[PDB]
């Protein structure tokens, strides 16, 4: 059953870092790319890096310099930091899975509030 | 670095229309593209990937075309069940880009 769920800091003061969590069930990371995408309020997806299953990464261009994606294959863990967060970093946080050209599965998403 | 850009923003249809919706590239992605579904407090859903190809369990009535920086969606005769945002995603290299969405409302 191939399953993703993301877990995050719920509200978060502007300045700091931040941390999200996927926790994958039902495959293996080193078959699978996993991709971040986020969604603000009100608006459409961005995506913003991913991890592939050799560990190599990309990252969206424009925040590049603020974020970091790794993983656990033995935790089937995949993580997101993003430094220096600014209030417009408000948004629902998503990881989902890579294959042949694809976004096949999604977590649900984590709600991320920059605020303070 | 590719954007994509969707038109139109929004749409209004009835259900059993016919409709539409484009996806432009700022530069060639040779085909490497997707669409994905997403209801109201939904993740998105995969529908179409390589252009053309239905992911399992997608109806018949959605079809995808295009090449070069040009690619559509047509959906035939409107579900009540294909209410919600469309958005066309690029494999081109890295990094990868969505284009802005589509809002169809019923």
């Known amino acids: 059953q191939v399953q993703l769920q993301e877990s995050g800091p719920g509200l978060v003061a502007p300045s700091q870092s931040l941390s999200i969590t996927c926790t994958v069930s039902g495959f293996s990371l080193t078959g699978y790319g996993v991709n971040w995408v986020r969604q603000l309020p009100g608006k459409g997806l961005e995506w913003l890096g991913m991890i592939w299953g050799d560990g190599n990464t990309a990252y969206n261009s424009a925040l590049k310099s603020r974020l970091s994606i790794s993983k656990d294959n033995s935790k089937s863990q995949v993580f997101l930091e993003m430094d220096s967060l600014h209030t417009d970093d408000t948004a629902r946080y998503y990881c989902?899975?890579?294959?042949?050209?694809?976004?096949?599965?999604w977590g649900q998403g984590t709600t991320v509030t920059v605020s303070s | 670095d590719i954007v994509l850009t969707q038109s139109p923003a929004s749409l209004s249809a009835s259900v059993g229309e016919t409709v539409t919706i484009t996806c432009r590239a700022g530069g060639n992605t040779h085909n490497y593209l997707a669409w994905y579904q997403q209801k109201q407090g939904k993740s998105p859903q995969l529908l179409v990937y390589y252009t053309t190809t239905l992911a399992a369990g997608v109806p018949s009535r959605f079809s995808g075309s295009g090449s070069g920086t040009q690619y559509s969606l047509k959906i035939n005769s409107l579900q009540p069940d294909d209410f919600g945002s469309y958005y066309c995603?690029?494999?081109?290299?890295?990094?990868?880009?969505f284009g802005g969405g589509t809002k169809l409302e019923i």
């Open positions: 995603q690029h494999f081109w290299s890295t990094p990868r880009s």
């Open positions: 989902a899975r890579e294959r042949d050209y694809r976004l096949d599965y």
